[PDB]
């Protein structure tokens, strides 16, 4: 019988956006005990990247702090005061890989971690979002209503502040119940190793894929044509510069459809450019929601970038010498099956061995060990010459994963 928690017990907090209010909250954090419940909000889909537009904390006695990073930077707040106030306290985060890069970028230094998402997965929780996890362990429902908000909106509305507060409101109580359960399932040291690793990986700049410009939707329709790819490259790059400069989501400045369209058509002049309508008109987000007015706020920034700016870029791309145009295991089992059936036979023996361990320990198979590490291991015509335990370790698997898995995997490979 879950109960809806509509507001925090202490009420909806005011935003901390002045230097005195920051120094006050830091003092209260210094005066408090136990773990630090943490979270962050970002204006994804609206602003450029993954800059935090809100930062949320709770500590027993200090209560909930909703901290405005941009206002506090302008007020000249020192985030090192925060670190000194908190010390080596445990940070509780749900999916810590999301918020640790942003915390690191503000200059915060979490020294210990409890990841409630990581813990839920190890425990075998099949739906592991915050709301599903707190209902499972605390019998309390959070109505997650303002998840896709533009967190750059000032002043922050009371409902949004309430959402942001509710996201740190139950994390210390979550940790307590989930530690007790991990210990009883005998997974507490597995948990700890996964926290250690997440803090190592997350606290630092976030992962960007190998070649960013290649991630334009429908790019495959243009991959045979290297001059089109030079156009896609050039357009993506300039769009990325201007999106960062003007602090706006890149696809609000120029759609992927427009990029692919002009890469196909290759307009050589101004009249040829004007015939392509999409690149001459402002991007319009239509979702038939209250969100439409929220995107429409960015129209004056969108209008600041003119069609002519893309026209110049297409010219540059088309003036490139042809010799300057651009061109571990496959994740797709189809590729394995079609091209390397003998390697796949070995992999399938490995996969069923890892699945068996998943069952016997009641841990999701992808959590037991990262599926890609097993694929990389079997991506060879000499699988019996693998030092399984060492290879898996060098891949980035944790000691507990190697100790649980490697011998049985070695046996499966041998047959």
Which residues in this chain contact Na ion in the complex, by CB under 5 A?
39, 98, 167
Nearer residue to Na ion within complex by CB, 98 or 272: 98
Which letter does DSSP use for residue 221 in this model? G
Structure-block tokens of residue 253: 């400045």
The rounded distance, in Å, linking the Cα atoms of 239 and 408 is 50
Question: Could you tell me the smallest distance in angstroms from the CB atom of residue 7 to Na ion?
Answer: 16
Q: Which two tokens stand for residue 10?
A: 């202490």
Structure-block tokens of residue 67: 């901290």
In the complex, minimum distance from the CB of residue 191 to Na ion, in angstroms, rounded to a whole number: 19
Minimum gap (Å) between residue 141 Cβ and Na ion:
16
Residue (142 or 388) nearer to Na ion, CB: 142
β-partners of residue 357 are: none
Question: Smallest distance from the beta carbon of 396 to Na ion, in angstroms?
Answer: 23
The full DSSP string for 234-250 is HHHHHHHHHHHHTTS-H
Q: Which residue is nearest to Na ion (CB)?
A: 167
Q: Which two tokens stand for residue 301?
A: 């920034």
b/e 156-184 (16+ beta carbons within 10 angstroms → b) = beeebbbbbbbbbbbbbebbbbbeebbee
**285/295 Cα distance (integer angstroms):** 7
CA distances from 282 to 23, 153, 254, 267, 327 (A): 44, 22, 8, 19, 31
Q: Which is nearer to Na ion, 39 or 68 (CB)?
A: 39
Q: Give the helix ranges, DSSP H, for 94-225.
A: 96-106, 116-122, 130-138, 158-166, 171-185, 188-202
**Identity of the residue, 157 or 371, whose beta carbon is nearer to Na ion in the bound complex:** 157
Tell me how far, at minimum, the Cβ of 93 lies from Na ion, in Å.
Answer: 7
Single out the residue of 91, 284, 42, 271 nearest to residue 199, CA to CA: 91
Shortest Å, Cβ 167 to Na ion = 4
206: DSSP letter: P
What count of other Cβ atoms lies within 10 Å of the Cβ of residue 361? 17
Shortest distance, CB of residue 162 to Na ion, whole angstroms?
12
Q: How far is the CB of 168 from Na ion (least distance, A)?
A: 8
CA distance 292 to 353: 50
- CB of residue 144 vs Na ion: minimum separation in angstroms? 8
* Rounded Cα–Cα distance for residues 290 and 37 (Å): 31
**Token pair 């290759």: residue:** 266
Which residues is 57 bridged to in the sheet? 38, 65
Identify which of residues 103 and 298 has a Cβ nearer to Na ion in the complex. Answer: 103
> Using an 8 Å Cβ cutoff, are 413 and 388 in contact?
yes
Nearer to Na ion, 98 or 376 (CB): 98
Question: 167 or 175: whose CB is closer to Na ion?
Answer: 167
Which of 115, 194 has the CB closer to Na ion? 115
Q: Measured from the CB atom, is 149 or 405 closer to Na ion?
A: 149
Q: 3-state SS string over 59-102?
A: EECCEEEEECHHHHHHCCCCHHHHHHHHCCCEEEECCHHHHHHH
Minimum separation from the CB atom of position 149 to Na ion (A): 10
A 10 A CB-CB count for 257 gives: 15
Cβ closest to Na ion, residue 82 vs residue 160: 160
């Amino acid at each position: 019988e879950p109960k809806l928690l509509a507001e925090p017990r202490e009420g909806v907090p005011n935003v901390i956006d002045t230097l005195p209010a920051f120094r006050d909250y830091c003092s209260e954090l210094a005066s408090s005990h136990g773990s630090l419940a943490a979270d962050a909000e970002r204006a994804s889909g609206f602003r450029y990247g993954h800059e935090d537009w809100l930062v949320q904390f709770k500590r027993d006695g200090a209560g909930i702090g909703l901290l405005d990073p941009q206002a506090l930077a302008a007020a000249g707040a020192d985030w090192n005061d925060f670190n000194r106030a908190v010390g080596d306290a445990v940070w509780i985060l749900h999916d810590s890989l999301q918020d640790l890069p942003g915390f690191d970028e503000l200059g915060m230094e979490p020294q210990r971690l409890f990841d409630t998402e990581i813990a839920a997965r190890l425990l075998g929780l099949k739906r592991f979002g915050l709301a599903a996890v707190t209902e499972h362990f605390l019998g309390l429902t959070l109505a997650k209503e303002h998840s896709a908000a533009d967190w750059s909106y000032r002043p922050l509305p009371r409902d949004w502040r309430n959402y942001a507060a509710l996201d740190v409101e139950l994390l210390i109580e979550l940790e307590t119940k989930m530690r007790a359960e991990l210990k009883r399932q005998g997974k507490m040291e597995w948990a700890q190793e996964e926290f250690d690793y997440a803090l190592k990986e997350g606290l630092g700049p976030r992962k960007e894929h190998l070649i960013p410009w290649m991630h334009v939707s429908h790019i495959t329709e243009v991959m045979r044509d290297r001059q089109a790819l030079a156009i896609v490259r050039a357009l993506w790059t300039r769009r990325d510069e201007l999106a960062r400069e003007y602090d706006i989501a890149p696809t609000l400045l120029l759609s992927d459809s427009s990029i692919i369209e002009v890469a196909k058509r290759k307009p050589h002049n101004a009249a040829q450019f004007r015939s392509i309508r999409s690149i001459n008109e402002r991007v319009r987000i239509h979702t038939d929601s209250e969100q439409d007015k929220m995107f429409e706020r960015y129209a004056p920034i969108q209008r600041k970038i003119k069609p002519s700016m893309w026209k110049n870029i297409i010219q540059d791309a088309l003036a490139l010498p042809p010799s300057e145009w651009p061109d571990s295991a496959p994740k797709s089992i189809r590729v394995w099956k079609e091209r390397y059936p003998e390697r796949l036979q070995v992999l399938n023996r490995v996969r069923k061995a890892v699945s068996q361990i998943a069952e016997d320990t009641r841990t999701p198979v992808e959590i037991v060990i990262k599926p890609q590490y097993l694929r990389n291991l079997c991506w060879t015509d000499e699988p019996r010459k693998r030092d399984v335990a060492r290879f898996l370790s060098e891949q980035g698997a944790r000691d507990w994963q190697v100790s649980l898995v490697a011998e049985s995997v070695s046996r499966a490979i041998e047959g």
